[model samples]
Target: MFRKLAAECFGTFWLVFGGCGSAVLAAGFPELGIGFAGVALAFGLTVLTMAFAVGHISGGHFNPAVTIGLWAGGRFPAKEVVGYVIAQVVGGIVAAALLYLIASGKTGFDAAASGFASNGYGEHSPGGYSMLSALVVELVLSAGFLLVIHGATDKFAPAGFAPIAIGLALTLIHLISIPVTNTSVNPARSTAVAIFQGGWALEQLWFFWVVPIVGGIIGGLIYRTLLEKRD
Candidate 1:
C-alpha cells in the first residue's frame, strides 16, 4: 500500500509539473512559445512517460478523476480510493508550489497576474468562452477521458498500448478545449494552480471538481454496464 501510494504521488507530481510547466514556461515564450498545441503535447507526453515508468505499481492513475472513474467502472477497489486521491492531490500541490517558486524568479513575473496556467471561464478564459461553454466542455471532455482510459486499459484491448492511447486522448482533449476552460479534466490539476491564482480561480474551482467527477462516474458506469465484457 505504501509503495502504491508513493507511486501515485510521484506519477501525479510528474504529470502536473510537466503538463503545467509547459504552459507556464514555454506556451507563450515571446516568439518561441510552444502555444496550445505544444502544451497539449506536453501533457500527453508526461502521462505517456510516467505510465511507462510506474504504471505497473500504481495502475498509473495520475488523476483523481481517473481513479474515481475506474472505481465506478468496477476496475478499482473503493477502499483504496481515498488514499490514492490524497496522494495524487498532495503530489499536484507540491508540484504547483515548485512551479510557483521557479516562475517567481523572473524579474516582472506575478503568479496571480499571470494566472500561472490556472483554469477558468468567461473573461478569465483564454478564448473568452462563457460559463456554460466551460461547464459543457469540461464535463464532456472528462467523460470522454474516462471512456478512453477504461477502453485502452481493458483486458480485451491491446496488451501494451494503453499508455499510448490514453496519452493521445488527453492531447486530443486539450486540443479541443484549452481555450474554453484551460482543459482541466483533472480536479487535482485545477486545484494545484488555482490555490496559487486565488481570487477568481478559487471561486470557480467547484465546477472543475463537480463536473469532472460526475462526468467520469457517468462514463465509467456507461462502459461497465454496456461495453465491458461479462465473461
Candidate 2:
C-alpha cells in the first residue's frame, strides 16, 4: 500500500511536471516553437511513461477523473479511491508549486498574469472559446477519455496496448481542446496551476471540476452498463 501510493504520487507528480512544465517552459518560446502540439505530446507522453512505471503498482490513475471513472465502472474499489485521489492532488500541487517556484526565479516571469498554463474559458481561454464551448469540450473529452481508458484496459482487451491507446487518446484530446479550455480533463491538474494563477482561473475553476467529474461518471456508467460483458 505504501509503495502503491508512492507510485501514484510519483506518477502524478511527473504528469503535472512533464505536462504543465512543458506548457510553462517551452510552449511560449517562439524560436523553440513547441506550441500546442508539443504541449499536447508532453501531456500525453507523461501519462504514457508513468502508466508503464506504476500501472501494476498503483494502477497509475494519475488523474482523479480516471480513478473515479474506473470506480464508477466497477473496475476499481471505492474504499481505495480516496487515497489515490488525495495522493494525486498532492503530487500535482507539489509539481505546480515547484513549477511556480522555478519559474518565478527566472526573471520577469508572471505566473498569475501569464496564466501559469492554467485552465479557463472566455477571457482565459487560449482561443477565447465561450463558457459553453469550454463546458462541452471538457465534458466530452473527459467522457471520451474514460471510454478509451476503460476500453483499452478491459479484461479481454488486447495485451500491452492499453498504455499506447490511452496515451494517444490524451495526445489527440489535448490537441483538440488546447485552444478551447487549455485541455483540462484532470481536476487536480486544473486545480494545481489554478491555485497559482490566482485570478480568473480560480474564478472559473468550478467548471473545470464539475464537468470533468460528471463526465467521468457518465463515461464509467456508459462503459459499465453498455460495454462490459455480463457473462
Candidate 3:
C-alpha cells in the first residue's frame, strides 16, 4: 500500500507539473506560442510518459477521479480510496507550488491575470461560458475520459496500449473542452492551483471537484457493467 501511494504521489505530481505547468509557462508565451494544441498535447504526454514510468507500481491511478471511478466500478477497493486521493492531492499541491515559483520569476507575471491556467466558469471561464454550461461540459467530458481509461485498462483489453489510448483520450477531451473550463477533468490538478491562485480560484473550486468525480464514477460504473463481464 505504501509503495502504491508513493507511485500515485509521484505520478500525480508529474501530471500537474507537466500539464498545468505547460499551460502557465508556455500556452500564453507571446514569443513562442504553443497555443491550445500544444497545451493539449502536453497534458497527454505527461500521462503517457508517467503511465508507463510508474504505472506498474501504482496501477497508474494518479488522478482522484480515476481512483473514485475505479472504486465505483468495483475495480478498486473502497478501503483504499482515501489513501489514493490523499496521495494525489498532496502531489498536486506540491507540483502547483513548484509551478508558482517558476511562474513568479517572470518580471510581470500575475497568477490571476495570467489565470495560472486555473479552471472556472462565467467571467472566470476562458470562453465566458455559464456555470451550468461549464458543469455539464465538465461532467460529460470527464465521464468519457474515465470510460476510455477503464476500457483501455481492462484485463481483456490489449496490453502495452492502455497508456496510449488513455493519454490520447485526455488530449482529445482537452481539445474539445479547454475553451469551457480550461479542461479540468482532474480534481487534483484544479485543487493544486486553487491553493495558490486563492481568491477566485478558491471560491470556484467546488465545481471542479464535484463535476469530475460524478462523471468519472458514472463512467466507471458504465464500463464495468458493459465491458468487464463480457465474454
Tens digits of lDDT, candidate 2, 17-104: 6655665554244454546455566556666666555565566545567766666556675445866667556755775776666566
Stretches of model 1 off by over 4 angstroms after superposition: 1-3, 26-28, 31-44, 54-57, 70-79, 107-111, 115-128, 179-181, 200-202, 225-231
Question: RMSD to the native, candidate 2?
Answer: 4.0
- Where is model 3 more than 4 Å wrong at Cα? 1-3, 31-43, 54-57, 70-82, 107-110, 113-129, 179-181, 198-205, 219-231
Model 1 deviation from the true structure expressed as Cα RMSD, one decimal place = 4.1
Screening candidate 2 with a backbone cut-off below 3 angstroms (N, C-alpha, C), the clashing residue pairs are none
Q: Mark the regions of model 2 whose C-alpha exceeds 4 Å error after superposition.
A: 1-3, 26-47, 53-58, 70-79, 107-111, 115-128, 179-181, 198-201, 225-231
Q: What TM-score against the true fold does each predicted structure earn?
A: 0.72, 0.73, 0.71
- Per-residue alpha-carbon lDDT of model 3 for 1-231, expressed as tens digits? 667666766666666666666656543454544354565666667666666665565665455666766655566764357666665567566766766666666522435665544532422664645666666776776676666665656573465466666656666666656655555446665666566665664567666557657776776776666656792
Across 139-213, the per-residue lDDT of candidate 1 in tens digits comes to: 676776676666667573465467666666666666556655555445665566566664574557566557656
Once model 2 is optimally superposed onto the true structure by TM-score, how far is the C-alpha of residue 118 displaced, in angstroms?
4.2
Model 2, residue 11: what's the lDDT?
64
